[PDB]
Amino acid sequence: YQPTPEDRFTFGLWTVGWQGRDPFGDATRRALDPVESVRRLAELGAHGVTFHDDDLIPFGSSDSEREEHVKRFRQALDDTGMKVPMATTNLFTHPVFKDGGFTANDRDVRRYALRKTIRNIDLAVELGAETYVAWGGREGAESGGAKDVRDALDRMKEAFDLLGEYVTSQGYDIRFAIEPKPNEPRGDILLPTVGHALAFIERLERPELYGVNPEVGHEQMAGLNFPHGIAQALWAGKLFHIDLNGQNGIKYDQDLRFGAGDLRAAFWLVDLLESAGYSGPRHFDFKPPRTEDFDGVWASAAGCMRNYLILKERAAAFRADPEVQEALRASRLDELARPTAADGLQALLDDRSAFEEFDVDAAAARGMAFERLDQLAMDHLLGAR
Amino acid sequence: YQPTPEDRFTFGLWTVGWQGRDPFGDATRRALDPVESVRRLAELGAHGVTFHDDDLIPFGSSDSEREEHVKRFRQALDDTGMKVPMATTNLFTHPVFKDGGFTANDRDVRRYALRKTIRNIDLAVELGAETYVAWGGREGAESGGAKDVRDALDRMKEAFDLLGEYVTSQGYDIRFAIEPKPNEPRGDILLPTVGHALAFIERLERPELYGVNPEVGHEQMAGLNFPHGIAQALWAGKLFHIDLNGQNGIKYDQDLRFGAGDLRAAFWLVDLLESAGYSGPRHFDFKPPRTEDFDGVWASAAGCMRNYLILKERAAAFRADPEVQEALRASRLDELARPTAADGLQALLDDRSAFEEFDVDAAAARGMAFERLDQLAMDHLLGAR
Amino acid sequence: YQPTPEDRFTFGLWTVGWQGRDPFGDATRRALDPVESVRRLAELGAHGVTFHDDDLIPFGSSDSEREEHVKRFRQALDDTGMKVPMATTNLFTHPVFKDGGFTANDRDVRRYALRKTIRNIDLAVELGAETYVAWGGREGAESGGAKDVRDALDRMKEAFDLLGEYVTSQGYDIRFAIEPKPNEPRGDILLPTVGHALAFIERLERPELYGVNPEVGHEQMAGLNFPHGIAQALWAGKLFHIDLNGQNGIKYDQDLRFGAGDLRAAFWLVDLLESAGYSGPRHFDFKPPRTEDFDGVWASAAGCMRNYLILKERAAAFRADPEVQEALRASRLDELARPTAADGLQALLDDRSAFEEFDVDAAAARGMAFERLDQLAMDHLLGAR
Amino acid sequence: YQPTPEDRFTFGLWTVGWQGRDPFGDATRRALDPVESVRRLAELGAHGVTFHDDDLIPFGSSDSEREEHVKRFRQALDDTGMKVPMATTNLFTHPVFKDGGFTANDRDVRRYALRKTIRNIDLAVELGAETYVAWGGREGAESGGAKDVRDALDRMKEAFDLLGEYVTSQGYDIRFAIEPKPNEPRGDILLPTVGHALAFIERLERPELYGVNPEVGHEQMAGLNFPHGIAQALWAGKLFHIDLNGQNGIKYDQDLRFGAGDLRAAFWLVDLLESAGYSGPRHFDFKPPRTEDFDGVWASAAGCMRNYLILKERAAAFRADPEVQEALRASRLDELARPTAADGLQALLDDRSAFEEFDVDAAAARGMAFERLDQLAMDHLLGAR
Ligand code: PRO
Ligand code: PRO
Ligand code: PRO
Ligand code: PRO
Ligand SMILES: [Mg+2]
Ligand SMILES: [Mg+2]
Ligand SMILES: [Mg+2]
Ligand SMILES: [Mg+2]
Ligand SMILES: [Mn+2]
Ligand SMILES: [Mn+2]
Ligand SMILES: [Mn+2]
Ligand SMILES: [Mn+2]
C-alpha cells in the first residue's frame, strides 16, 4: 500500500503545517517552511500540494518578499516534481472578515474580499492550478437579525459571477469549487451542505464554471451520508475536487486523518470514487492532532494515503467477487439501474400489471437480501473472506 | 390571538388523527373520522386540511367505498367552508414500499408507485388542491451496497418527469413540492435537505413545475438552520408550501406543535415568511403527543395557530420599532442589501479603495453591534420592551 | 469465525422476532413463535435468549395460556441447550404506560408497573436468569411542566428499592441492570446515559444489587464514546450485562446488527471487554432491517456473532504484536497506569521536580506518538499488517 | 429587569475578556485588564467575578509580578464591592497539557498539574472563593489506543483525592466542583456529562467535598436536557455551582449569552433553580461573539443578566397562576410527588387494586393534559396571558 505520485494524493500546506492552536490551546509545534513540507510530502509519495494565499505568502508581505516566497516554493516544486492542482483564498482568519468576505455586511469588506481573491487566482494560474476553491467559513451568523439570508445570497451570487467574469476575461482554464460546511466558525454557515451549494450554482450566470469541493467531515457535521452527497454531486457532473479526512459524527470539525472517524463511510466513499472514475486530486484536508511531534505529523499524513489505498483494494475486491455480483443481483441492484418506464406515460397508464393486476402482497413478501450483501461488504473490508 | 380562515392555517388529516402508535408503543387514541376532524379544525379557526390518499380512503377500498368516503369528506368541507390546498401520496406505510416507491430496487414497485400517485393527483385536483407534495420517506438505505445513489436519482428524475408529463397532459394547474428529510424511517434518505431537493429540481425536464415543501423538524434533524433554508428556497422562487412544527434538535422526528422545540427559530421563521410575503398555506404537520386524549389533541392544534399568531405580532413589532430600525442600520443590514460592485469588474479592479488603499485595520475595528440588535429581538419576543 | 455456545452470544426474542413495524410503516414479516426463534438461534451457535414478559406470554393471557406458553418455551430450551441469562419487563408498549411505569404521574400506574415487574421476576428466576434488566423507555417528558424530575427520581428510587426488597425477601440471586437511553420514545428519557444511571444507583438502599446494561446505540444517540462509558462502568464494578448493536450517530435508534454503524467503536469495545475479562453474556439487541425476509433475519443475526469474533481476533492480535507493545510504551500507556503520587501529598509538595524545577517546555515538546499507534490499530483491524 | 449585586450574577475574567481568537480566526479585540473588567461588570450590576490562575497572573510571572497583579485585582474588588466566589486552574492552554493534566500519560505532567492546582487553591482561598472548579478539558483522546480509560480514572481519582487531602490539611472551607463536557478540545472528554461526574464523585475518598459545575452548553453538546441534568444534580445534593450560557444544539461549544440558544430550556432551567432554592452564584461562562467591539461585549454581558431576570419573572408568574395550579393538578403533578407504596412491599403485593383488579384500560384512557399545561407555560413565557 505504498503511494506514488500516480495516485494523485495532495495535501494542503495548512494541514501538515498546522501548529496545533485550537480554541482552548496554544501551539504545540513550530511553524513549517512550505519548502520543507513540499519535500517531506514528496518523500512520502504525494502528488502535490495546495495553498491559501496566506499560507504561502504571509499576510502583509511586500512585493519583494512575495516574489521570494514564490521563488522558493517554485524551486521546491521543481526539486521534487510536486504539482499544485488547487489553490484558495483565506477569507476567514483576518479580523476584517469577522462577518464574512463575499457576504460581509460592510460593502467595503466585500470589495476587498473580491480583490484579495482575484490576486490569488492569478498566482494559482501561474503555479498551474486547475481548480480554485472557495470556502465561505465566515459567511453566516450567530443571531437571526444579523444576516438577511436572501440579501446575503444576492451578494454571494454577485461575487461568484464577478469571479467568473474575471477568469473569462483572462482566458484562464481554471474552474471554481465551492466548499460547503454547516457551521464553525459561524453559528450557521451559508450554503451549509453539498445540496445547498449545488442549488446555488444553478443561479449563477455561468454555472458551467462552478462545482463543489465537498469535505468528508463537513457533511458529517450535519449527520449526513457523505457517499450519498458525493453521488449527487457526481450525478450533477459537479465533483470538481474533494477533501478527504475523518470525523466522529456531530461535533466540532475534527479533521482526523482519512480512514479515521467513520471507517465504513470511508470504504463506501472510495468504492464510489473508483467506480465512477473520479479523476481529480485525492486531497487531504486534515490536521495531525496537536498531541503529535513532527514525526507524528508525517506518520499521520502517510496514514491518509495508506488508508485510501487499503480501502481501494478492498472495494475493488468486493465489486469483483462473483459471490458479491450474485448478491447484487439478488438484491436487484441491476433492476435499480433499468428505466422505470421507457415505454412512456401512456403505456404505463394502460399497463394493468402496474396497478389493477399488480400483486402488492407478492412484491412485499420478496426480501431485499440487503443484510447478506452488507456482510459480504464487511467481510471484504476486514479481510475475512 | 384567535385564528380565522383568513390566516390560511391548514392541518393534515394524519396530524390530529394520529392514534399514538410509535416504535415502542401501541395506540393511545381511537381513530378519527376525517369528517369529525374537518369539523373540529374548522371550529378552531382552521382554513383547511390536507391528506394522503390512504388517510382519506382506506387502502384496498372498492370503487363504491371510495366514492362514499369522498362524498362524506366533500360534505364536511361544504358544511364548514374548509378547503383542501394540498394533497399527497402514501408511498411509505405499505410493506411493498419497504425499499422505496419511486426508487425501489424492484422496477414493478416503482411503476406501481407512479400509478398510485397519478390516481391521487386526479383526486387532489377534484378536491381543489393547488399543491401536490412528495415525501420520499422510503427512498434511501441502511447499508452502502443496497442503493446505488446515482441510479436511484436517475429513477427519481424519471418518476418526477413522468408526473410532470401527466399533469401537463391533463391541463392541471397543480404544482409539485418535494419534501426533504435526512433520515427516518430509512437510515439515510435521498434528497436529505432543502438544498439537495432544490439542486435535484434543476435537473428535471420542466423545473418550473416543482418546488420544495420544507418541514421545520426535518431540517433541524440535520442540525440545520431552518429560517436559513427557507430563505434559500425563497431566493430560488421555490417555496411552494411549508410544514410547521417543533423539534428539539438532532433525534427522532418529534412533530411537536409549532412553537415548541426551538422557539427562537420559530420567531425568525415567522419574521421571514411575513417579510417575504409568503402567500401559501401555513400547514402544520405535527402530532399531538400520545399522552393526550382528544381534548388534548384539539388543544395542541389550537396551540399551533396561537403560537404562529403571537410570533407574527412580535416579529412585526420588532421590524416596526424605530429603535430596531436604527440598530439594523448600526449593524449595516442596509449595506448588506446594496450591490457589491454595480460599477462592474474593471471598475473594481481599478479601485484603489478596494485593496491598495483599503484600511483593513479600521474596517476590522468596526463592531457589528449584533448583540444589541439580538437583545432587542429577544426583548420583543418576550414582551419585555 | 464460527460461534459456539461457549462464546456466550445471546439474543432477545424481540430482535429476530421484530415484525418490521416502524413509526411510518406496517409489518413486513409474520410473527415468530418463540419456539422457532430458539431453534434457529441455537442452529446459528447462540448460547441463549432473553425476553420481556410480553414477548413470551401475550399480554392478557389466562393462567392456563401462560402455563402453556412457558411449557413450550421450556421444551425449546431443553431441545436446544439454550439458556436464558436475562429477562426484563415491558413497561412501554401498553398505552397505560404512556407517561411511564415507575415514574408515571398516576400513582395507580406506578403500583401496577411494580406488580407487573415482580410477577416477571419470579418467572425469570424460574427460567434461570441471573440478570433482570430495566429499561425505563417511557420515563421522561416531551414538555417541561409535565414531569418534575426530582419527584420522578424519588419515585424511581422507591420502585428500585422495593424490587431490591422483593428479591432479598425471596432469597433470589438475581441482580438488576438499569439500561440508559437518552431519548425515544419520550422526548427526553430519565437516566439518559451510563453516567446518570451509575450515579442514581449510588442513592439506592442496596446499591450492590444494581448495575448497568448499556447499549451501543443508546450512548451513541447522545454522541458519546461507547467504549469510554463501558470503561467507566467497569471501573465502578457495575457492568452487569451489555447490549450490542450498531448505530450511525445521532438519530433515531437504528438497532443495526453489531459491527454495523461505527465499526472502529465496535473494535475498541471488543478490545476493552476482552482485556477487562467481562464474563457476562454478549447480548445483541438489534433489529434485522424491515427490508429483509426471514432468511435475511437469520443472516443478520449470524453477522452479529461473526463480527464480534472477527473483532476479537484483530484486537487480540493488536495487543499481542510486539510492535504495538513498543508503540504503547512510546506513547506512555505504561506511565498512565502508574500512580501519580504514591509518595504522598507532602512528598509531592516538597518535590521541586514537580514544579519549581519542572522543565515544562521539554515535557511539552515530547510527542505522544498517538498517530503511529492508531495506524497500527487500523492496520490490524483491516488485516493490512 | 435591572440586576443588582443581590442577584448573585458572576462572570469569568475570560468571558468578557475573550479576544475573539477561534480555530479559524485571529483576535478581533484587544486584551482587557482584569481591573477594567471588574469595574465594567460592577457598573452593570454584577455581584462578582471568577478566574483561572492564568487569567489573573500571566503564565511564567515572577513572584514580584504575581504580587502586583494580585494587588491591583484586590484593589479593583475593594473599589467596586465585587466578590470572587469561585476560581479554577488552567490545565488546558499550555502545550504541556496536550494530553491532559491529571490524566496525562506522562506522570511528570500529572504531578505538575497537581502542583499548579494547589498553588491556585491557596490564592482562591485568599481572595475569598468558596468553590474551586475543575474542568478537565484535555482529559480524553482522539483515538482508542491512546488512553486506557480505567487507568485514566484511577489517575483522576488519585488527583482529586490528593486535592481533598490538601484542603483538609489546611483547614480550608472551599469545596470542589467538577465541570463536565462531552468533547472539544479532545475528541472525547472523560466524565462527559453531569451523570458521569456524579458517578465518579461517589468513588472519591471524601465525596462530601465534591459536587458538579454543569454548563448549559456542555450538556446540550450531547443533546441532553439541561434542566433534567440539573434536577438530578439537585436530587443528589451536588449542585455546588452552575455555568449559564446558550448553545444551539450539537456542534462546537458556542458560549452564547444566556437566553440565546435554547430559549425554552433557559426558561425551564430558571424555573427549576428558583423553585429548588439554588443559593449559589448565577455564573455566566459565555463569549461575546468576535463580531463585537467592546460596547458589544458589555451589551452581551448585560443581556445575560437581563434574560435571567425576565425568565425569573415569567417562571414565577407561571407557578403562581391559579389556572396553572389547576392544570398541574389536572396533569397529576401532585400525584407524582406522593410515594408509590408507603404502605410497604407486602401491602403492595396483597393489593388487588394494583394488579388483579386494576382497570388498565380506564387508566390508559385518562389523558395527561400536558399540551394545555405547556401552552400555559408558553403563554407565560411570551407575555401572552
Ligand atoms: O473525471 C471525472 O472526475 C468525472 C467523474 C465521472 C466521469 N467523469
Ligand atoms: O407569494 C409567495 O409565496 C412568494 C413569496 C415571495 C414573493 N412571492
Ligand atoms: O467478570 C466480570 O465481568 C468483571 C469484569 C472485570 C473483572 N470482573
Ligand atoms: O442552597 C442550595 O443551593 C441547595 C438547593 C436545594 C436546597 N439547598
Ligand atoms: Mg476543506
Ligand atoms: Mg411533513
Ligand atoms: Mg437494549
Ligand atoms: Mg464553563
Ligand atoms: Mn474540516
Ligand atoms: Mn416530521
Ligand atoms: Mn436500541
Ligand atoms: Mn462552554
mmCIF file with all atom_site columns, C-alpha atoms in Angstrom, chain D residues 21 35 106 116 125 133 180 215 221 236 299 331 349 369:
data_model
loop_
_atom_site.group_PDB
_atom_site.id
_atom_site.type_symbol
_atom_site.label_atom_id
_atom_site.label_alt_id
_atom_site.label_comp_id
_atom_site.label_asym_id
_atom_site.label_entity_id
_atom_site.label_seq_id
_atom_site.pdbx_PDB_ins_code
_atom_site.Cartn_x
_atom_site.Cartn_y
_atom_site.Cartn_z
_atom_site.occupancy
_atom_site.B_iso_or_equiv
_atom_site.pdbx_formal_charge
_atom_site.auth_seq_id
_atom_site.auth_comp_id
_atom_site.auth_asym_id
_atom_site.auth_atom_id
_atom_site.pdbx_PDB_model_num
ATOM 1  C CA . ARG D 1 21  ? -9.497  34.010 18.671 1.00 0.00 ? 21  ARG D CA 1
ATOM 2  C CA . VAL D 1 35  ? -9.149  45.725 36.712 1.00 0.00 ? 35  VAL D CA 1
ATOM 3  C CA . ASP D 1 106 ? 3.238   11.444 31.310 1.00 0.00 ? 106 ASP D CA 1
ATOM 4  C CA . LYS D 1 116 ? -0.246  24.184 39.652 1.00 0.00 ? 116 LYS D CA 1
ATOM 5  C CA . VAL D 1 125 ? -8.930  30.978 49.417 1.00 0.00 ? 125 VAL D CA 1
ATOM 6  C CA . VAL D 1 133 ? -13.903 24.355 39.740 1.00 0.00 ? 133 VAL D CA 1
ATOM 7  C CA . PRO D 1 180 ? -18.311 18.006 32.631 1.00 0.00 ? 180 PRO D CA 1
ATOM 8  C CA . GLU D 1 215 ? -22.710 24.246 31.928 1.00 0.00 ? 215 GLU D CA 1
ATOM 9  C CA . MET D 1 221 ? -23.478 19.402 23.109 1.00 0.00 ? 221 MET D CA 1
ATOM 10 C CA . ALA D 1 236 ? -28.093 14.277 44.738 1.00 0.00 ? 236 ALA D CA 1
ATOM 11 C CA . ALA D 1 299 ? -24.149 44.738 25.911 1.00 0.00 ? 299 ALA D CA 1
ATOM 12 C CA . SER D 1 331 ? -51.862 16.534 34.850 1.00 0.00 ? 331 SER D CA 1
ATOM 13 C CA . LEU D 1 349 ? -48.251 -7.463 46.861 1.00 0.00 ? 349 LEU D CA 1
ATOM 14 C CA . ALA D 1 369 ? -53.405 17.127 29.678 1.00 0.00 ? 369 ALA D CA 1
#
